[PDB]
Design a protein around this ligand. Sequence first.
Ligand SMILES: CO[C@H]1O[C@H](CO)[C@@H](O)[C@H](O)[C@@H]1O[C@H]1O[C@H](CO)[C@@H](O)[C@H](O)[C@@H]1O
Ligand SMILES: [Ca+2]
Ligand SMILES: [Mn+2]
Length: 237
Amino acid sequence: ADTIVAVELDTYPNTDIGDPSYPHIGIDIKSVRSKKTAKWNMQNGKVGTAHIIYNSVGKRLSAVVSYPNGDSATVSYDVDLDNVLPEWVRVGLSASTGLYKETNTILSWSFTSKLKSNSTHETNALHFSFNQFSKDQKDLILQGDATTGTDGNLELTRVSSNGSPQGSSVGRALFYAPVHIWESSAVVASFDATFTFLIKSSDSHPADGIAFFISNIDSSIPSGSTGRLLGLFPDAN
Ligand SMILES: CO[C@H]1O[C@H](CO)[C@@H](O)[C@H](O)[C@@H]1O[C@H]1O[C@H](CO)[C@@H](O)[C@H](O)[C@@H]1O
Ligand SMILES: [Ca+2]
Ligand SMILES: [Mn+2]
């Protein structure tokens, strides 16, 4: 298959596949069944901010998701990503809807990765930030239903003209350039990502969520990965 490391903002409890009974954030290492989760209050129609942070020294993948009123949830998981991810990856955002739906609107996304080594701050680095997306965002690989629009946003999943999110949708956006996420001779490999998002739904139980993910460079939406699989995984194993 792909190799996926992800931080999921999971809006819809799929308890039959190990989701906690409440919306949650989670750290997913090669499985949709998060290695760690934290209860998350998704604030319908509010703009949230997710931060993901890791460095190869601490070997701890951390995420926090917050809303302007100060509510937040955080999850951290100890993992040496050198032993999980390929050396070269692509980084992306994914989202899905299913029977129930929600907008999976990304308003901004930044990412920074650095590899530092042996001597001085002699280093390879990648940093990108999108605080606006354009209709033809050539440095994004859009997959599935993901679109960017003149409205400055990245709609990961289908939204109708009337602004209504659609079910059975899956979409991703990957940064165009592969990222050298680790290297054997790198003394420190660190990355951080931030994205802001607006999940809004008229469904009493919106679904399915948004994820920041890191994958093999040729990662594509696995078949049948709408709904609970968040566009990341081919199955719920
Ligand atoms: C009830 O289970 C479906 O919906 C939830 C909420 O969206 C998903 O988490 C779950 O994966 C299921 O989605 C599948 O089935 C939906 C129809 O029942 C379909 O719309 C989805 O695209 C997906 O196949
Ligand atoms: Ca879920
Ligand atoms: Mn989950």
